[PDB]
Design an enzyme around this catalytic site. Sequence first.
Site, PDB file in Angstrom:
ATOM      1  N   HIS A   1     -21.287   2.320  15.349  1.00  0.00           N
ATOM      2  CA  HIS A   1     -21.463   1.999  16.759  1.00  0.00           C
ATOM      3  C   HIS A   1     -22.245   0.548  16.824  1.00  0.00           C
ATOM      4  O   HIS A   1     -22.978   0.293  15.708  1.00  0.00           O
ATOM      5  CB  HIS A   1     -22.491   3.030  17.592  1.00  0.00           C
ATOM      6  N   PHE A   2     -22.184  -0.092  17.796  1.00  0.00           N
ATOM      7  CA  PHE A   2     -23.016  -1.070  18.008  1.00  0.00           C
ATOM      8  C   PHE A   2     -24.146  -0.715  19.161  1.00  0.00           C
ATOM      9  O   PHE A   2     -23.852  -0.294  20.127  1.00  0.00           O
ATOM     10  CB  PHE A   2     -22.178  -2.354  18.522  1.00  0.00           C
TER      11      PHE A   2
HETATM   12 PT   LIG Z   1     -20.703   3.007  20.910  1.00  0.00          PT
END
Ligand SMILES: [Pt+2]
Length: 124
Positions: free
Chosen positions: A119-120
């Site tokens: 994820h970012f």
């Molecule tokens: Pt995400």
Amino acid sequence: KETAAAKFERQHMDSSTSAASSSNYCNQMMKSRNLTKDRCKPVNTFVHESLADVQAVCSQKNVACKNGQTNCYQSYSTMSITDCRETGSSKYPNCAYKTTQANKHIIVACEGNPYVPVHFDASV
Ligand SMILES: [Pt+2]
Ligand SMILES: [Pt+2]
């Protein structure tokens, strides 16, 4: 199917260009990476660094994730990114985005074996 890692690379990686090509970059990129498929993804960041560089963030500065989990990591160096932010007049299916280039530290969540971005979380 698609792994969490693959999905991070589809949503967040664009090593091909150094910077936010144009005023139109997000409009094209959000669509081509399938982020405008079932809704207009409201905000999304692309990273213009090598995969290896981004993967290595998972061994950099360990910081709290925004959701309170502990598996987030902040890049010791700034990275070239592009922030895509859906306009006010944007209406699905014709998703419209403001393209903003920046150089900032990225924060990603990592998981798995190998331990890779999934994820970012943020840029700072
Ligand atoms: Pt995400
Ligand atoms: Pt800094």
